[PDB]
Design a protein around this ligand. Structure first.
Ligand code: HEM
Ligand code: F
Length: 153
């Protein structure tokens, strides 16, 4: 699809709609994770020892917001520039995933949980042209993190 001026306009618009409700969209995002894969729960310090996903845990919210911001920035950078740029942050990201016991096969888990989360966030505006656009941007960003984990291990 590329990333036409018209596709980019569509991701920006849909991310703005996401940030508009962090405690919701972030606790949703963790449940769609634990639905696609239950075991994933022992990984998270703030989920260990718990039974249910905490709803007002700042550690949890801060964590999940950073996740989506990073996917959106990726999409604009693709329409302007044509690419996703790897910086210090993405590199330290890769380290911390490895410490915590995260692998590649975990990533379609978190993608589906993010497409499903954005299809839920935009509702009737949803178009092929938009699904195509977030898919392009996540795939493009995951390519870059997975790269950095492999490197931290
Ligand atoms: C493009 C996709 C992804 C992005 C942008 C991303 C981003 C991040 C960030 C920014 C942090 C640190 C947050 C903090 O310091 O507060 C983090 C931590 C973590 N991530 Fe990810 N992530 C991605 C995919 C995944 C996947 C597939 C998994 C596996 C289930 C995962 C598991 C974790 C865990 C266990 C931690 C440590 C949390 C701790 O115990 O406190 N991430 N991730
Ligand atoms: F994460």
């Amino acid at each position: 699809g590329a990333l036409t001026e018209s596709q980019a306009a569509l991701v920006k618009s849909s991310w703005e709609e996401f940030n508009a409700n962090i405690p919701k969209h972030t606790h949703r995002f963790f449940i769609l994770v634990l639905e696609i894969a239950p075991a994933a729960k022992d990984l998270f310090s703030f989920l260990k020892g718990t039974s249910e996903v905490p709803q007002n845990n700042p550690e949890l919210q801060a964590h999940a917001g950073k996740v989506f911001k990073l996917v959106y920035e990726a999409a604009i950078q693709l329409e302007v520039t044509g690419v996703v740029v790897t910086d210090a942050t993405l590199k330290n990201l890769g380290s911390v995933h490895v410490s915590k016991g995260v692998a590649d096969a975990h990533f379609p888990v978190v993608k589906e949980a993010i497409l499903k989360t954005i299809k839920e966030v935009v509702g009737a505006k949803w178009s092929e042209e938009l699904n195509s656009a977030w898919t392009i941007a996540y795939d493009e960003l995951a390519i870059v993190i997975k790269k950095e984990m492999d490197d931290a291990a």
